[PDB]
Every structure is written in structure tokens, then in C-alpha cells.
Design a protein around this ligand. Structure first.
Ligand SMILES: *[C@@H]1O[C@H](CO)[C@@H](O[C@@H]2O[C@H](CO)[C@@H](O[C@@H]3O[C@H](CO)[C@@H](O)[C@H](O)[C@@H]3O)[C@H](O)[C@H]2NC(C)=O)[C@H](O)[C@H]1NC(C)=O
Ligand SMILES: *[C@@H]1O[C@H](CO)[C@@H](O)[C@H](O)[C@H]1NC(C)=O
Ligand SMILES: *[C@H]1O[C@H](CO)[C@@H](O)[C@H](O)[C@@H]1O
Ligand SMILES: *[C@H]1O[C@H](CO)[C@@H](O)[C@H](O)[C@@H]1O
Ligand SMILES: *[C@H]1O[C@H](CO)[C@@H](O)[C@H](O)[C@@H]1O
Ligand SMILES: [Ca+2]
Ligand SMILES: [Ca+2]
Ligand SMILES: [Ca+2]
Ligand SMILES: [Ca+2]
Ligand SMILES: [Ca+2]
Ligand SMILES: [Ca+2]
Ligand SMILES: [Ca+2]
Ligand SMILES: [Ca+2]
Ligand SMILES: [Ca+2]
Ligand SMILES: [Ca+2]
Ligand SMILES: [Ca+2]
Ligand SMILES: [Ca+2]
Ligand SMILES: [Ca+2]
Ligand SMILES: [Ca+2]
Ligand SMILES: [Ca+2]
Length: 523
């Protein structure tokens, strides 16, 4: 005979009455013939019906078998043969479906196109039939949907559908909930936390912060200094987010002038710069990632001038000797100045040290003309030390120095002068014919020919004009010559005038009286 029983029922539950099926009143000495490790059954003498004495969990008995049966024999001592019975447990919904873990994740790439279905974790329910697993439901998401594959086997395969393309740069991971439902009401359920991990595709190219990097630096800039810093943006991950910087202008000398750190992207100075050589350095640099993805930006170096140059004087006209008769205003120097620098560093101030003798005049533009201020006189000063100082107007100031030595020429304006205003010479009567009797000296302040004395004598006729016959002088000896002997009784004294003239045109002359006195002797 067969019967049934609900699972997990308390001890003493109703089972098909045994006595009414055997054919005897509720003495009999009847006992159960089966043998288990433990037994869950015991017949009740109160009603003659078997009542279970232990909790029945067919999940711990038949597991997933659709029909769970417990067939056992029973023994009646009144008779000589046994009676075989069989009781099939039914299934109730007490177990909830279970997943493999509390947290499971699915890897999805960034390049994954919409329409891709990814396997979802499949749950398990110990129950059988309606009480077993029935359906799934997925939390709504803008990027995903749910897809179920029910089968003839009764098992459903769940998988998610990609609705919108994913992007890790906006959000790396998603958080969704997958719920599992059975059919045995009161229905159990099981939620499951799923994380959508987005992989990385190299779809981000490096993009520099600014499209143009600008720096303004002086020319005196020391090599090894840090010009600037260049940064590029790559939101990717790993080598796809790494940056490497290098110039695109690879052949010109600018590559030798600057240094660009391949990693840090620092623009530094390698060689000294010069505003006069070149002040506009336009270059184009480029950054790359792990792949061939690259970005460009322009770096512009602007150099500015610095006072590191001295003024340069070029002389056009020089007149080292000047005539002493020069009026105040005659030029003695003609030159100009020019600085290599620009602006206030290029303006020049040509200043002679203020002296009374000369003055400097800025005739036109920056051409300078050095002139005189008074009349010169080489008998008081024949030499002049001139120091023209050309200082630029920048800061700090740089001054070049031009030295001129000025020797004035000789113009004959000074006549020769004798040693005395008047000379007197004594000689006794006896006079050896043609002998020299005196010595007269003269001097001239001028130089060279304008100081060369040419001695002469006035031509006033003594009786018969023996001025030449009486006396003679040589142009250079400066000595007097008595030609004839003298008697105190013919003449006593003779007055002449000696002349001195400088031998150069125009000549300057000077006469001075000179008297010869004879002396008386024993005639
Ligand atoms: C303007 O300044 C210059 C120098 O800055 C003065 O020149 C003088 O020149 C002589 C040489 O010409 C200097 O030395 C001497 O040299 C001769 C040979 O030439 C030598 O024999 C001597 O033993 C001596 O070393 C001299 O030192 C130099 N300075 C002075 C003060 O005489 C020139 O005199 C200056 N002009 C005026 C108007 O002061
Ligand atoms: C001689 O000297 C006097 C005074 O120095 C001068 O006045 C006179 O003109 C001179 N004689 C001649 C011929 O120049
Ligand atoms: C899963 O869902 C069932 C039915 O919605 C609930 O009864 C259960 O408590 C869990 O929330
Ligand atoms: C769904 O809800 C259960 C509670 O029944 C959680 O344990 C689970 O992690 C998910 O959040
Ligand atoms: C000729 O010699 C006489 C001798 O007294 C000098 O006085 C004169 O100057 C000249 O040289
Ligand atoms: Ca159970
Ligand atoms: Ca069950
Ligand atoms: Ca269930
Ligand atoms: Ca992206
Ligand atoms: Ca990416
Ligand atoms: Ca990248
Ligand atoms: Ca320079
Ligand atoms: Ca300069
Ligand atoms: Ca300068
Ligand atoms: Ca003079
Ligand atoms: Ca000179
Ligand atoms: Ca003179
Ligand atoms: Ca003279
Ligand atoms: Ca005499
Ligand atoms: Ca005599």
C-alpha cells in the first residue's frame, strides 16, 4: 500500500492508518521491520495510524529527485508474513535559492559594442518543481538589460545585454542587483550584488593643458635653468596614460639651445642666448602615450634685451696739431657713437669732462663734434689731455672711454728778445785788424724756424758810410767784429743798432742799441 506525507512536519503527524489497511482492531505485537541509521516513524496505538517521529527533509534524502519515496516493511507477530508499504514525501517551499558567492563581477571592455550578452551567475534551489527556481529579475540600468534563456530542461540561463556603450573615463565600475525567484508561494528570493568592471581601451589621446606655452626671459639666462613645465592629459590607465615629450623641430639649432625632459616635460636652457642674434624662438613639441596616440602644442620663447654691451665710438676726423691762432669754435674732433643694445640700453651720452678749453657739441643725430672754447697759446701749454666719456643710459651703466692728446702748432707771434735792453763794450786804442770784440745773445719764445735768430746791423752812414768797414757781425756767431784799428783821437764812441729777425715768413724783428767805447793809452 502507498501513502504520502508533507516534508518537515512535526513529530506525530497524520499518515495513512495501518490497522484499517491490514484488517485488525487497534496484543498484536506489531513492529517496524526496516532499519535506518535513525528512524523517523512510529505507529500510534491511539488511532492505529503511523505517525512520524522525526523531521523529514527530502532535500537531505532525495535532493533533486522529483519523487521521494520511503518504502519499508512492517511485521505483525500474530501472522507469519510481513506487509510492505511505501510513503512518498511531497515537497514544500522552505529553501531559498542560493548563489555561489555574495559578490561576483563581470569584465567588460570599453570597446564593447552594444548588443553583447554576458553570462550572469546562475543560482540553485534545493526544492523541486514549482518550489524550485523559477525566474530572475535585473535592476534597471541605462547601460544594461536582462536576457533569460528558458529551456526544456527547466533550467534558465541568464545573461546581461549591453544597451549603451561603456566608458571607463566617466565611471570605472557599475553596481547592479540580480534577484532570483522561485514559484512556491510564499515565494522565497535571493539578491546578488554584481559589479561591472570596465576594461581600458587606448581611446584617449594626450591633450596639452594650453595650446600655446609662452615664456619671456632675459638674454643673460644661465644654461641649466628651468624655462617652463609642459603637461599633457591622458586619462587612460597604464602605459596608455603615460606621456613622453619630444620636439617636432628636430634639425635646427634650437634643439641644441633647449632641453626637454622626455618624462617630466620640463623646458630648460642648454646654451646661452643673445637678444641681438635672435629673440623669437617658436617650437612645436609633441607627447605620446603607450600607443601611437600623440598630441601637439606650441612653445614660444620671447627674449628681451639686457645691458651687456658697451658703446662704440668711430672717429671720422682728427686734428692733433691745430694752429695757435685758431678762433674759439674750430673743430678738433669729429666722431659718432653707436650702442648694440636697444632702448634705454642703446641710448648714448657722450660727455667730455667739463674743462674751460674745449666743449663738445651734438651737432645732429648721435654724431658728436668736439670744438674749442678759447684761443690757445703754446708758450703756456703746448699739450692737452682729453678724456671723452661715453656712457649709456641703461642700468647698470656701461661707459667706454676715448683719450685724445692734443699738441698745438706754432704760429709766429713772438719776436726775438736780446739779453739786455742796451749793451756796452770797452776796447783800448790798439785793435788787431778784424778781431772779435763782443758777444750778444738773443732768444725767441717760439719753436724751430720762428726761433732762429738772423743778426743784422742798421745801415746809418758814418762819415763815408764805413759801418760795414768799421764793424761786422755774423748771422749765427752773435759776435761783433772790429775791422780796423782805433785811435781815441779820431773816434771815442760809436753807437750802432743790432737787429734780430726770426727766419720764417712772416718774420719778426727787434733792434737794440749797442755802444763801443774806446780807451785811451800811452800814445
Ligand atoms: C697727459 O697724461 C700723460 C700720461 O697719462 C702724460 O704723459 C707723460 O708721458 C711720459 C712719456 O712721454 C711718461 O713717462 C716718461 O717717459 C719717458 C720716455 O717717453 C721716460 O724717459 C721717463 O722716464 C718717463 O717714464 C710720463 O710718466 C707721463 N706722465 C706725466 C705726468 O708726465 C702727460 O704729461 C699728460 N699731459 C699733461 C699736460 O699733463
Ligand atoms: C727798432 O725798435 C723800435 C722799438 O723796439 C721800433 O719802434 C722801431 O720800429 C724798430 N726799427 C725798425 C726799422 O723797425
Ligand atoms: C525576495 O523577494 C520575495 C518576493 O518579492 C520576498 O518575499 C523576499 O523577502 C525577498 O525580498
Ligand atoms: C539583496 O538583499 C539581501 C538581503 O536579503 C542582501 O544580503 C544582498 O547582498 C542584496 O543586497
Ligand atoms: C771773438 O773772440 C773774442 C775774444 O774776446 C770774443 O770776445 C768774441 O765774442 C769772438 O768770439
Ligand atoms: Ca526542505
Ligand atoms: Ca523543501
Ligand atoms: Ca525555493
Ligand atoms: Ca573613453
Ligand atoms: Ca579609455
Ligand atoms: Ca592614451
Ligand atoms: Ca647680448
Ligand atoms: Ca644685449
Ligand atoms: Ca649698452
Ligand atoms: Ca703764441
Ligand atoms: Ca694724437
Ligand atoms: Ca708761438
Ligand atoms: Ca719768433
Ligand atoms: Ca791816443
Ligand atoms: Ca794812439
Amino acid at each position: 500500500i502507498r501513502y504520502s506525507v508533507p516534508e518537515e512536519t512535526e513529530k506525530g503527524y497524520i499518515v495513512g492508518n495501518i490497522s484499517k489497511d491490514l484488517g485488525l482492531e487497534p496484543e498484536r505485537g506489531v513492529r517496524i521491520i526496516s532499519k535506518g541509521k535513525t528512524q523517523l516513524f512510529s505507529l500510534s496505538p491511539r488511532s492505529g495510524s503511523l505517525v512520524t517521529a522525526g523531521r523529514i527533509d527530502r532535500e537531505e534524502l532525495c535532493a533533486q529527485s522529483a519523487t521521494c519515496l520511503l518504502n519499508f516493511k512492517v511485521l505483525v507477530e500474530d501472522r507469519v508474513k510481513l506487509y510492505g508499504v511505501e510513503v512518498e514525501v511531497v515537497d514544500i517551499n522552505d529553501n531559498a535559492p542560493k548563489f555561489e558567492a555574495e559578490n561576483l563581477f563581470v569584465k567588460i571592455s570599453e570597446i564593447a559594442a552594444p548588443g553583447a550578452r554576458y553570462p550572469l551567475p546562475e543560482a540553485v534551489d534545493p526544492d523541486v518543481g514549482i518550489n524550485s527556481l523559477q525566474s530572475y529579475q535585473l535592476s534597471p540600468n541605462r547601460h544594461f538589460s536582462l536576457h533569460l534563456q528558458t529551456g526544456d530542461d527547466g533550467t534558465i540561463n541568464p545573461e546581461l545585454v549591453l544597451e549603451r556603450t561603456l566608458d571607463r573615463e566617466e565611471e570605472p565600475t557599475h553596481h547592479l542587483v540580480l534577484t532570483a525567484y522561485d514559484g512556491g508561494n510564499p515565494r522565497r528570493s535571493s539578491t546578488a550584488l554584481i559589479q561591472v568592471t570596465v576594461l581600458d581601451t587606448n581611446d584617449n589621446a594626450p591633450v596639452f593643458d594650453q595650446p600655446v606655452y609662452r615664456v619671456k626671459v632675459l638674454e643673460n639666462v644661465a644654461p641649466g635653468t628651468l624655462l617652463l613645465t609642459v603637461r599633457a592629459s591622458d586619462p587612460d590607465e597604464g602605459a596608455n596614460g603615460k606621456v613622453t615629450y619630444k620636439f617636432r623641430k628636430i634639425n635646427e639649432k634650437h634643439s641644441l639651445l633647449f632641453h626637454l625632459h622626455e618624462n617630466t616635460g620640463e623646458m630648460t636652457v642648454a646654451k646661452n642666448l643673445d637678444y641681438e642674434e635672435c629673440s623669437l624662438y617658436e617650437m612645436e613639441i609633441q607627447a605620446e602615450d603607450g600607443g601611437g596616440l600623440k598630441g601637439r602644442t606650441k612653445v614660444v620663447v620671447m627674449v628681451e634685451d639686457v645691458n651687456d654691451n658697451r658703446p662704440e665710438v668711430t672717429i671720422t676726423s682728427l686734428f692733433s696739431p691745430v694752429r695757435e691762432d685758431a678762433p674759439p669754435g674750430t673743430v678738433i674732433l669729429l666722431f659718432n657713437a653707436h650702442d648694440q643694445d636697444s632702448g634705454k640700453n642703446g641710448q648714448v651720452v657722450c660727455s667730455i669732462q667739463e674743462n674751460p678749453s674745449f666743449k663738445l657739441e651734438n651737432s645732429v643725430d648721435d654724431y658728436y663734434r668736439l670744438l674749442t672754447a678759447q684761443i690757445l697759446d703754446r708758450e703756456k701749454a703746448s699739450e692737452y689731455n682729453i678724456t671723452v666719456t661715453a656712457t649709456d643710459r641703461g642700468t647698470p651703466s656701461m661707459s667706454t672711454e676715448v683719450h685724445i692728446t692734443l699738441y698745438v702748432a706754432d704760429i709766429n707771434d713772438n719776436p726775438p728778445a736780446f739779453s739786455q735792453t742796451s749793451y756796452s763794450v770797452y776796447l783800448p786804442e790798439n785793435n788787431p785788424r778784424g778781431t772779435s770784440i763782443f758777444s750778444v745773445s738773443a732768444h725767441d719764445p717760439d719753436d724751430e724756424e720762428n726761433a732762429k735768430v738772423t743778426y743784422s746791423l742798421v745801415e746809418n752812414t758814418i762819415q763815408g758810410a764805413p759801418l760795414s768797414s768799421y764793424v761786422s757781425i755774423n748771422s749765427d756767431t752773435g759776435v761783433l767784429y772790429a775791422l780796423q784799428s782805433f785811435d781815441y783821437e779820431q773816434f771815442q764812441n760809436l753807437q750802432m743798432q743790432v737787429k734780430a729777425s726770426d727766419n720764417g715768413h712772416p718774420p719778426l724783428s727787434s733792434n737794440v742799441s749797442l755802444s763801443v767805447f774806446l780807451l785811451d793809452q800811452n800814445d
